[PDB]
Coordinates of C-alpha atoms in Angstrom, one line a residue:
Chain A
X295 CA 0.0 0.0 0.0
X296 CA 1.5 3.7 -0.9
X297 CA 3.0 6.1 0.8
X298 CA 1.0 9.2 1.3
X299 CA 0.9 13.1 2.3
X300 CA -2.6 14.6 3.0
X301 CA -2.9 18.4 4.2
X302 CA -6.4 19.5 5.3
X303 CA -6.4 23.1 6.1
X304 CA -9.7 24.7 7.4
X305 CA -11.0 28.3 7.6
X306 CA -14.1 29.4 9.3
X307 CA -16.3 32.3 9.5
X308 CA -19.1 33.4 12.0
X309 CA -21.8 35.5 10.6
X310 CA -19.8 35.9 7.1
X311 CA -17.0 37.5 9.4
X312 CA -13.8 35.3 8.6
X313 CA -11.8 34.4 11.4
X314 CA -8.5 34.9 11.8
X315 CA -6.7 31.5 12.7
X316 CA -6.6 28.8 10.4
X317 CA -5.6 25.3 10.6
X318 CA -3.6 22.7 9.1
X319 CA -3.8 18.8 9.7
X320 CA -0.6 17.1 7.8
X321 CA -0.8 13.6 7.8
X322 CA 1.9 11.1 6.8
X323 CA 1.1 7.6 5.6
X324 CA -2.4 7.8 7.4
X325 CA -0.9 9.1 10.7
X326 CA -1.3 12.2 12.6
X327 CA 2.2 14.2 11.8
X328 CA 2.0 18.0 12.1
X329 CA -1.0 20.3 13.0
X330 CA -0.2 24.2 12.1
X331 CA -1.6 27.3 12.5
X332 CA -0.4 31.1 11.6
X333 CA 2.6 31.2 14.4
X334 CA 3.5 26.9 14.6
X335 CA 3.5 23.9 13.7
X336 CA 3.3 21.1 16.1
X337 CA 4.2 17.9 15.8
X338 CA 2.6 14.7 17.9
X339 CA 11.6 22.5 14.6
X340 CA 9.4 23.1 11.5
X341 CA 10.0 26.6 10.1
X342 CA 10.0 25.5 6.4
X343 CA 6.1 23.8 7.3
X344 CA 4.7 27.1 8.4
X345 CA 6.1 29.3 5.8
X346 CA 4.2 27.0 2.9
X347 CA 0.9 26.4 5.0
X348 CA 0.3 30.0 6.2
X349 CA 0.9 31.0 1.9
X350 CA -2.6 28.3 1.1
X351 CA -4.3 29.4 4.6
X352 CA -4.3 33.6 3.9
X353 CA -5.3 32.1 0.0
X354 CA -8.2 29.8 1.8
X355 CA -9.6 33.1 4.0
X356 CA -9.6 35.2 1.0
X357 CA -11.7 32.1 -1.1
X358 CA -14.1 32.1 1.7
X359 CA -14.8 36.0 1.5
X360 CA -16.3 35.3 -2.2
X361 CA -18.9 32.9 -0.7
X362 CA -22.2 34.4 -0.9
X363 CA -24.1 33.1 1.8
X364 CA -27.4 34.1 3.2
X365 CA -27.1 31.4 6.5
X366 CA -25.7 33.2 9.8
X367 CA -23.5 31.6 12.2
X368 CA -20.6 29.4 11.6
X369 CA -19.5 28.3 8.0
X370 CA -15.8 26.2 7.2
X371 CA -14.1 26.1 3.7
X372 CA -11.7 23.4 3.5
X373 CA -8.5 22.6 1.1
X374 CA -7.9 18.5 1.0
X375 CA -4.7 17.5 -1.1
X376 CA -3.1 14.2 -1.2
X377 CA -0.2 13.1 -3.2
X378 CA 0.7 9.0 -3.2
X379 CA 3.5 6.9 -4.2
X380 CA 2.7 3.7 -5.2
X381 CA 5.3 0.3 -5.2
X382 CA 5.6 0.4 -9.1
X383 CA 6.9 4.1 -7.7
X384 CA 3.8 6.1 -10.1
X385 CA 1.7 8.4 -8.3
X386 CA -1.8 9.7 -7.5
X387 CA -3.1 12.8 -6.5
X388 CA -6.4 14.6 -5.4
X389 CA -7.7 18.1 -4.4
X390 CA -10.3 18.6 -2.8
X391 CA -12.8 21.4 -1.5
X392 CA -15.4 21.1 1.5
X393 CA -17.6 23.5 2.4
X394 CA -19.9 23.0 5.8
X395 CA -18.2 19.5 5.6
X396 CA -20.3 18.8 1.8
X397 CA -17.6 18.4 -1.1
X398 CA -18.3 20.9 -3.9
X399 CA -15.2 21.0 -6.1
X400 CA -11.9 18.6 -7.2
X401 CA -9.3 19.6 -9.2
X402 CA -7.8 16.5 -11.3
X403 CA -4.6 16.5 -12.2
X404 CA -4.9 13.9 -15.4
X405 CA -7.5 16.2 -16.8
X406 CA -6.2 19.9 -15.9
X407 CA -10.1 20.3 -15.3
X408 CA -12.4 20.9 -11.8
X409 CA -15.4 18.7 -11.4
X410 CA -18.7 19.0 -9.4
X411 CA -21.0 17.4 -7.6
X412 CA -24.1 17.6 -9.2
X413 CA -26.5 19.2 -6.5
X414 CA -27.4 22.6 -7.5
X415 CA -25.9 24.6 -3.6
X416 CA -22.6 22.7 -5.0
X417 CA -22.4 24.5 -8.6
X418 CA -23.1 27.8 -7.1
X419 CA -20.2 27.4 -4.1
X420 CA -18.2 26.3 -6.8
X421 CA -18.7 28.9 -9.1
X422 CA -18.6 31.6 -6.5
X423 CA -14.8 30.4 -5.7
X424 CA -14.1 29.6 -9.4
X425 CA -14.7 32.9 -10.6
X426 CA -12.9 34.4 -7.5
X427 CA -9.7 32.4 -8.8
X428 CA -10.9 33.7 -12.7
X429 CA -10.8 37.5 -12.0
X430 CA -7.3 37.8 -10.1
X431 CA -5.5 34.8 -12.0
X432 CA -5.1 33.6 -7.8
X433 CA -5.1 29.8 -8.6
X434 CA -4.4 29.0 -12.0
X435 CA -3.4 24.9 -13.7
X436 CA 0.0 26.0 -12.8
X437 CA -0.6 26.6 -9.2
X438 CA -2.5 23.5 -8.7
X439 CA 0.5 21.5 -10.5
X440 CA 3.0 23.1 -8.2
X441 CA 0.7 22.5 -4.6
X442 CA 1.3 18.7 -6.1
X443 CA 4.7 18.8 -7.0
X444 CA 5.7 20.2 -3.5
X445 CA 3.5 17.6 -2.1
X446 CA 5.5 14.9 -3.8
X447 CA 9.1 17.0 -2.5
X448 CA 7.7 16.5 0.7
X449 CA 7.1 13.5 1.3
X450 CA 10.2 12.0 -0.8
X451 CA 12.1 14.5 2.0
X452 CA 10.1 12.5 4.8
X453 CA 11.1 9.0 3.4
X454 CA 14.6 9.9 2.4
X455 CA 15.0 11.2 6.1
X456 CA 13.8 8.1 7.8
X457 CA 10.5 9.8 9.2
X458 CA 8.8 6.1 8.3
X459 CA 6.3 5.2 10.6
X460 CA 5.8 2.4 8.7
X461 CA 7.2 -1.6 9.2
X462 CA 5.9 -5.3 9.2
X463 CA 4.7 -6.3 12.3
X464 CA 3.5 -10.2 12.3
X465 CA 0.9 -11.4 14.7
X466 CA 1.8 -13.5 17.2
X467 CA -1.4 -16.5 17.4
X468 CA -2.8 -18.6 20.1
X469 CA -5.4 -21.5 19.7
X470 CA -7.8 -22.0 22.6
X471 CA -10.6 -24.4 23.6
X472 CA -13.9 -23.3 25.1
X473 CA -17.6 -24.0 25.6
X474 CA -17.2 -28.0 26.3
X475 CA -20.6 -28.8 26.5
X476 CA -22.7 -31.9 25.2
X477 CA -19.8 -33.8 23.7
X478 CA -18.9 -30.5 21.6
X479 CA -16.2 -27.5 21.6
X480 CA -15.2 -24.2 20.3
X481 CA -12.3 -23.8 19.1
X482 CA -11.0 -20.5 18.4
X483 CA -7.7 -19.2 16.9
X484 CA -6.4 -15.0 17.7
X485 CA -3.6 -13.1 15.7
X486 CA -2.6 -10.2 18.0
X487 CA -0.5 -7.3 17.6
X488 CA -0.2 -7.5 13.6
X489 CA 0.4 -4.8 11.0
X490 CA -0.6 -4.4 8.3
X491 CA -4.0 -4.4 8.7
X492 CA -4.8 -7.4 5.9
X493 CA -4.9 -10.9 7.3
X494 CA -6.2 -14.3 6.2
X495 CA -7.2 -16.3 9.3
X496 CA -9.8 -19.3 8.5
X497 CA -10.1 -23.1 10.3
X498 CA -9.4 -25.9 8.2
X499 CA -10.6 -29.5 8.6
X500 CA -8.5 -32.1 7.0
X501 CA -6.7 -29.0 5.3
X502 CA -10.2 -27.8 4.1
X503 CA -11.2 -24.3 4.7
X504 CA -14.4 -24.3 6.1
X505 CA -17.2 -21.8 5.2
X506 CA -17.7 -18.8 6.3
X507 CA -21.5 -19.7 7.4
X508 CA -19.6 -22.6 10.1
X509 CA -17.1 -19.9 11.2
X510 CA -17.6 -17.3 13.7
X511 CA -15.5 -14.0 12.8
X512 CA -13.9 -11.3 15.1
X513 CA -13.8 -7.8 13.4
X514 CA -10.2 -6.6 13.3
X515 CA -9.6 -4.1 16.1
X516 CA -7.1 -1.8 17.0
X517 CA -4.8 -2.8 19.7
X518 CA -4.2 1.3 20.7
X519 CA -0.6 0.1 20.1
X520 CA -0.8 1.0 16.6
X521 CA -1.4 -2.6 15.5
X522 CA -4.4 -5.1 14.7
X523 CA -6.1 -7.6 16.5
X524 CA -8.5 -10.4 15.4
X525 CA -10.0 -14.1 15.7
X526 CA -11.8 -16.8 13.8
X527 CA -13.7 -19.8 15.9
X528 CA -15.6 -23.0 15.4
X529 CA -17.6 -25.7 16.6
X530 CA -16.5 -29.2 16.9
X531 CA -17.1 -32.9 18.3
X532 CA -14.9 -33.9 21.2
X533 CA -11.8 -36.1 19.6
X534 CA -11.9 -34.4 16.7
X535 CA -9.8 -31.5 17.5
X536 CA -6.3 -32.8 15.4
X537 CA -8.4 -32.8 12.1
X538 CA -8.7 -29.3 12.7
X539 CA -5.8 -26.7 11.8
X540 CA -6.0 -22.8 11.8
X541 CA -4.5 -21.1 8.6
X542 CA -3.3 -17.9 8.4
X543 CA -1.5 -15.7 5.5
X544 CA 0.3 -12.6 6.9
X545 CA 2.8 -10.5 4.8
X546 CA 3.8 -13.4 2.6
X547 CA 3.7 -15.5 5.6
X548 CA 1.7 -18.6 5.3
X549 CA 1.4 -20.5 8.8
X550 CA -1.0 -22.9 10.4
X551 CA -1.7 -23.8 13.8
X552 CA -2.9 -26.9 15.6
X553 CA -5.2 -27.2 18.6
X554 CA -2.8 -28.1 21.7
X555 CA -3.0 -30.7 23.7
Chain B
X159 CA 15.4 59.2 -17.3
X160 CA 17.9 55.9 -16.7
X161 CA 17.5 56.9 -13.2
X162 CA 14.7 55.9 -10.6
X163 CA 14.4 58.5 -7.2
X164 CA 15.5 59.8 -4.6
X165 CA 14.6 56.5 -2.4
X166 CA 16.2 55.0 0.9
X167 CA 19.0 53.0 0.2
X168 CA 17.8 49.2 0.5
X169 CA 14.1 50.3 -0.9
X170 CA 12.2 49.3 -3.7
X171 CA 11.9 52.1 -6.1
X172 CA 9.5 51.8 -9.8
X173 CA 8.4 55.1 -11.4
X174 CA 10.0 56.9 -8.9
X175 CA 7.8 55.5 -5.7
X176 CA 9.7 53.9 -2.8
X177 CA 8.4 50.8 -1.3
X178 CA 9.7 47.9 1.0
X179 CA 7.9 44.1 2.3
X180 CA 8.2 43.6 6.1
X181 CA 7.2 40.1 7.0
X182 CA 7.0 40.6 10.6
X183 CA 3.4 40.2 11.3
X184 CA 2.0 43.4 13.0
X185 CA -1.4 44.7 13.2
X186 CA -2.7 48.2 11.2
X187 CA -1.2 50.3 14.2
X188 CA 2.3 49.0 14.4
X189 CA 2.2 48.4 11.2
X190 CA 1.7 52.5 10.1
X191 CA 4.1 53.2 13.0
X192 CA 6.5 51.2 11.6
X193 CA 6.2 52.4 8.1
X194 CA 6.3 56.4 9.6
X195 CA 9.7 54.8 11.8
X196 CA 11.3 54.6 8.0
X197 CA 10.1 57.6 6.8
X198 CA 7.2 56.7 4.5
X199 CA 3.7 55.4 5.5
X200 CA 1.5 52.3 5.0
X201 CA 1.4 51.5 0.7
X202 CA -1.8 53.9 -0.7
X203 CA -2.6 53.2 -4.1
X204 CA -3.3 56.0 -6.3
X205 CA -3.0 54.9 -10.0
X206 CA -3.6 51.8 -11.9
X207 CA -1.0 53.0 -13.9
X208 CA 1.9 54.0 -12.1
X209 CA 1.5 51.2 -9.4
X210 CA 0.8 48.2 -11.8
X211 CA 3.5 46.5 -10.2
X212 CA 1.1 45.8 -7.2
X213 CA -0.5 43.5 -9.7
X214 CA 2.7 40.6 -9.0
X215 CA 2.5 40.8 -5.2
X216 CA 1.7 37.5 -3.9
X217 CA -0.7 37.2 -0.5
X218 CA -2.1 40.4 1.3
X219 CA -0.6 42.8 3.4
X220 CA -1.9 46.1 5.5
X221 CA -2.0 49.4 2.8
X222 CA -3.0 52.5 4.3
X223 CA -6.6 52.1 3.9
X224 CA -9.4 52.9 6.8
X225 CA -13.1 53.4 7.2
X226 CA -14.7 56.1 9.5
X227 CA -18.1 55.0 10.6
X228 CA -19.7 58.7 10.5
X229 CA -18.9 59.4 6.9
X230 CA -19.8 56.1 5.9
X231 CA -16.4 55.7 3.6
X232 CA -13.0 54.5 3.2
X233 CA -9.8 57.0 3.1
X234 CA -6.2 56.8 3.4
X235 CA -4.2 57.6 6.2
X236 CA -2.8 61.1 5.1
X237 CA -7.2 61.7 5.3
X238 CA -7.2 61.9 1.2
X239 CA -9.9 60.3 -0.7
X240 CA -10.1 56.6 -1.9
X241 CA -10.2 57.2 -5.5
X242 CA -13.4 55.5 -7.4
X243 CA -12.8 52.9 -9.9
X244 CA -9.2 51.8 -8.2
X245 CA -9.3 49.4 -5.7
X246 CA -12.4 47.0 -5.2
X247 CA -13.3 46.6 -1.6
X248 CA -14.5 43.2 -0.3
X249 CA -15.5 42.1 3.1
X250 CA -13.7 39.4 4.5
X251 CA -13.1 40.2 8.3
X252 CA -15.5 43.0 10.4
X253 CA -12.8 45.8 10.9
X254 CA -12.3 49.3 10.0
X255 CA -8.6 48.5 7.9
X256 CA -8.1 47.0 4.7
X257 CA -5.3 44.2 3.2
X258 CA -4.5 45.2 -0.4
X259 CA -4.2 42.2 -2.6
X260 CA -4.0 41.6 -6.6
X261 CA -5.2 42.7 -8.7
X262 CA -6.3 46.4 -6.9
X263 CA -8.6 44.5 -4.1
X264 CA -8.8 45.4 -0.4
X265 CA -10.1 42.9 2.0
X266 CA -11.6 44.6 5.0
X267 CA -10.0 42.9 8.2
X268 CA -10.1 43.7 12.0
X269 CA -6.9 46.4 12.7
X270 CA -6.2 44.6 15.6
X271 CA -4.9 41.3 13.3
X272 CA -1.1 40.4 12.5
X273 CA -0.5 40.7 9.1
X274 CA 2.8 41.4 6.7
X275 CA 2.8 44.9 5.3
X276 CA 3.9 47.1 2.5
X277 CA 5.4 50.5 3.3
X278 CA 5.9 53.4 0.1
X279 CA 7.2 56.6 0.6
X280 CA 4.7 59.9 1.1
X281 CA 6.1 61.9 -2.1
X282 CA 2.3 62.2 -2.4
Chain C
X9 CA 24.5 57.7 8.6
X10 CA 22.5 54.0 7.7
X11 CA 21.0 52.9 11.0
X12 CA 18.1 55.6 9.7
X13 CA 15.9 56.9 7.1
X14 CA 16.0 60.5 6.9
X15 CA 15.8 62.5 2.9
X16 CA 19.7 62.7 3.2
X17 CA 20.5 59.3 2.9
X18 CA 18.1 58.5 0.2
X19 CA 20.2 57.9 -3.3
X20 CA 18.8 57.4 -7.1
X21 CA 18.7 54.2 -7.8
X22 CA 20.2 52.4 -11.6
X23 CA 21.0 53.4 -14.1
X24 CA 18.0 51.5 -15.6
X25 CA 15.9 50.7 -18.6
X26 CA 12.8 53.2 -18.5
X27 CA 10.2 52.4 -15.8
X28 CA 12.0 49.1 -15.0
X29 CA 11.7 48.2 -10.3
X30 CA 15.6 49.3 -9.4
X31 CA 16.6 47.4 -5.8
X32 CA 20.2 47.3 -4.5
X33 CA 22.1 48.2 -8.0
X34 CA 19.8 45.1 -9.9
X35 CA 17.0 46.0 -12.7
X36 CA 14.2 44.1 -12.8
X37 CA 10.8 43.8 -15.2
X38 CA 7.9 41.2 -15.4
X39 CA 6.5 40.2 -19.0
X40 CA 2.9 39.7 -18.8
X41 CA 3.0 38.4 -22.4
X42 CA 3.4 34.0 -22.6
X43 CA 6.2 33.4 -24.4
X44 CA 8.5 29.9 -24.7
X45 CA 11.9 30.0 -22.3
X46 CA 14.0 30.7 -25.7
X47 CA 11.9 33.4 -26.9
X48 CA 11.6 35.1 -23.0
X49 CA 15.6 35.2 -23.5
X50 CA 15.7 36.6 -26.6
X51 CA 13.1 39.7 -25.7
X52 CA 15.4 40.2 -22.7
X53 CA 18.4 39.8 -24.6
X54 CA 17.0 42.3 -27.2
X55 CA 16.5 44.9 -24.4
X56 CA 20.5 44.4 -23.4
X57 CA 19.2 42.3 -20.4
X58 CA 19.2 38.5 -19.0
X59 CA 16.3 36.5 -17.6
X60 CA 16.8 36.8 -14.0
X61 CA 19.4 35.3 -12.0
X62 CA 19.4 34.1 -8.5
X63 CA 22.6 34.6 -6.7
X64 CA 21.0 36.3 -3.1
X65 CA 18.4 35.9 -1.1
X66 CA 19.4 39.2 0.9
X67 CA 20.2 41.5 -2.2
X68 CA 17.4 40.2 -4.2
X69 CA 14.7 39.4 -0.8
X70 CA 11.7 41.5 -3.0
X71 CA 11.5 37.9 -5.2
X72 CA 10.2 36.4 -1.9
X73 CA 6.8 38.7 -2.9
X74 CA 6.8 37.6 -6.9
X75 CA 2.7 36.2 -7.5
X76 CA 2.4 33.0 -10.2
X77 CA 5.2 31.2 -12.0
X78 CA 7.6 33.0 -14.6
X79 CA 10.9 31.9 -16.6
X80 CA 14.5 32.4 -15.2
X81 CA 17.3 32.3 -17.0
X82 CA 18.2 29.1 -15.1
X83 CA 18.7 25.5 -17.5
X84 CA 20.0 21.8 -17.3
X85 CA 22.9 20.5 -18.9
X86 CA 22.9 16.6 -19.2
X87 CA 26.6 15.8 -19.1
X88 CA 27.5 17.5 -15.7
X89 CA 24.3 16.5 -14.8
X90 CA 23.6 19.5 -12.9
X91 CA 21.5 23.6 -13.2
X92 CA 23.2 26.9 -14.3
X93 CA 22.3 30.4 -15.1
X94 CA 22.5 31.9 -18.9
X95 CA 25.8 33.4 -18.0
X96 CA 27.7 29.8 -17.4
X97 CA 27.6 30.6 -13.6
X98 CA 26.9 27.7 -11.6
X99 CA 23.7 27.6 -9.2
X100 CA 24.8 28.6 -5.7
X101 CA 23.6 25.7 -3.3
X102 CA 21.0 27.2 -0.3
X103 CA 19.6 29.7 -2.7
X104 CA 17.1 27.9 -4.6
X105 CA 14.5 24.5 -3.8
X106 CA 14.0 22.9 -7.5
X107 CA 11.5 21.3 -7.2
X108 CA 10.4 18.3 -10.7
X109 CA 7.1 19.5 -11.7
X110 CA 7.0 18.6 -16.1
X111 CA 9.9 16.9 -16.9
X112 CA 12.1 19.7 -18.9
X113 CA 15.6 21.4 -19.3
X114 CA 14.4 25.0 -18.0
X115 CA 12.8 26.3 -14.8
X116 CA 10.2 28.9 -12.9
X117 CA 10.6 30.9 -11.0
X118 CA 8.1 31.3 -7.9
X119 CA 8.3 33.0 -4.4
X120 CA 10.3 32.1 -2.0
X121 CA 12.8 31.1 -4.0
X122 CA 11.8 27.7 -5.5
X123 CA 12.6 26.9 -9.2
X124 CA 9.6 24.8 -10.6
X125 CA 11.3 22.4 -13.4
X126 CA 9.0 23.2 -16.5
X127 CA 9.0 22.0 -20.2
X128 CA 11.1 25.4 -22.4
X129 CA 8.5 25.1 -25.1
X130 CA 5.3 25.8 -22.4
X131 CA 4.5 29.6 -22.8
X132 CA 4.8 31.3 -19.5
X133 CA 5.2 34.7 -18.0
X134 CA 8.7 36.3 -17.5
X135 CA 11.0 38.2 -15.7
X136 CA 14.5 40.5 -17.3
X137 CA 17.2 41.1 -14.6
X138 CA 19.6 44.0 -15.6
X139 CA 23.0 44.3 -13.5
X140 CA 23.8 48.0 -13.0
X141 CA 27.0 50.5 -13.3

């Protein structure tokens, strides 16, 4: 699964008044990294961050000033870019505009072109902020290739600097017997502490995976250790526990366990 | 004339205006102190013409623009008129000061709010 | 003295072309009109001028303002493998962040002092640098 950068950056106004902190949320292959405002940013020092960030937020307040809007109280605009890099090393990209929390416009890189949703509040949001950028040449193809291209700097600079919060963790799996009752047993089979997040866990009998429909599944839960945690059970006769094997496939591992005893 | 002046030293100078960028975030106040402390005043724009410059400056900074609640307008701080069909005005922030940004717009924002500024010489 | 800002320490600045921005004995001027990087050289060339040249961030700090994306005189040379200005000058590291935007042999200019690598036949917008006396 890529690598990814995503900065979501946030302005508000109350009662069309816009306010004047903004913030950023920079997150680095799915993790919390930096949150910035005007003076900082924060990490969970970074001078070059807040130079680039507080450039798109001042943009962002001035985008939210051309939003005609009737409703009182408090409104958000919001700027969503994320840049990818795949194994095969090509890359995606998206950009992204929120307003209220409701997408109303993407700009698509392939294409040079925005896109709308096709509610009606969407097309006049996005035609507000469109023309805005129109009549003061403010955010142009070029700009939005260049937001994209630093996106991609940055997070090579990340990887090539070790910030890689990122490694194979396998699970480590126990095989327990339960519910002993009227000559039949559960037996269930739990990989803890695993990353990544895709696993194959299923019983076998004779080497047979069972179906689904005879299994019962754990979801797969987050240890709050940054890893995964899950479990697959099933129901058999008393003395028949060596025909049945757990199987599981992590990270090009391919294992099975036995029920002990 | 080859020659652009009389300006500080380390200033900006195009059709003989004088202007310099200070990127330490101050609000309208400090900001026109500041500018007056080097012998000029907050940026006031006064012709599409001889200021088309303006038109490259990235982001938005303080100018010299206020609004007085009585007379119901904007003016610069030397108390001249805001020329019509030169700047237009938007509201961004509730305040009584204005950010210029290209291309000739001011974005009303509360004086009391940080901001970079522009400083240009009163040879007005 | 030049701790202050009084009307007898202010100097002329240039000499430069007519209604061209003078700042610290450098003459600059933006071209609104598109034009490929060789034919942004050339009308800068034709005015006895460069494309501009980045060589300090303290005597040349005003770029750090520039709006949008325009040519520099800044190009790749395959065999060293490595950027350098119009005048054979090599690029001074901890001045510019080049950053690989369209695969190309010429670059952009954009505030604060990145270089945006960019195709030299794509019409863009550009800026003439004049050294003075």
């Amino acid at each position: 699964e890529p690598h990814s950068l995503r900065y979501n950056l946030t302005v508000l106004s109350w009662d069309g008044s816009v306010q004047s902190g903004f913030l950023t949320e920079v997150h680095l292959d799915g993790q919390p990294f930096l949150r910035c405002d005007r003076q900082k940013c924060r990490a969970k020092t970074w001078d070059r961050e807040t130079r680039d960030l507080t450039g798109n937020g001042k943009d962002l307040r001035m985008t939210l000033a051309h939003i005609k809007d009737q409703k009182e109280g408090l409104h958000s605009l919001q700027e969503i870019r994320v840049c990818e890099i795949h194994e095969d090393n090509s890359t995606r990209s998206s950009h992204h505009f929120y307003y209220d929390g409701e997408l109303f416009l993407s700009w698509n890189l392939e294409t040079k072109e925005f896109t709308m949703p096709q509610s009606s509040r969407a097309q006049t949001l996005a035609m507000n902020v469109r023309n805005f950028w129109k009549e003061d040449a403010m955010k142009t193809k070029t700009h939005f290739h260049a937001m994209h291209a630093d996106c991609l700097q940055e997070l090579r600079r990340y990887l090539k600097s070790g910030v890689v919060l990122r490694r194979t963790v396998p699970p480590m799996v126990n095989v327990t017997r339960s519910e002993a009752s009227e000559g039949n047993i559960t037996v269930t089979c739990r990989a803890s502490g695993f990353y990544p997040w895709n696993i194959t866990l299923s019983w076998r009998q004779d080497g047979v995976s069972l179906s689904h429909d005879t299994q019962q599944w754990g979801d797969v839960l987050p240890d709050g250790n940054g890893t995964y945690q899950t479990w697959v059970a099933t129901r058999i006769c008393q003395g028949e526990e060596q025909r049945f094997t757990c199987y599981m496939e992590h990270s090009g591992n391919h294992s099975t366990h036995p029920v002990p005893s | 004339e080859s020659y652009c002046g009389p300006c500080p030293k380390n200033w900006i100078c195009y059709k003989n205006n004088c202007y310099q960028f200070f990127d330490e975030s101050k609000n309208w106040y400090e900001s026109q102190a500041s500018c007056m402390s080097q012998n000029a005043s907050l940026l006031k724009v006064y012709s599409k013409e001889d200021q088309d410059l303006l038109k490259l400056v990235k982001s938005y900074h303080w100018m010299g623009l206020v609004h007085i609640p009585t007379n119901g307008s904007w003016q610069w701080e030397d108390g001249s008129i805001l020329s019509p069909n030169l700047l237009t005005i938007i509201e961004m922030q509730k305040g009584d000061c204005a950010l210029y940004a290209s291309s000739f717009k001011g974005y009303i924002e509360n004086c009391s709010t940080p901001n970079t500024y522009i400083c240009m010489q009163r040879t007005v």
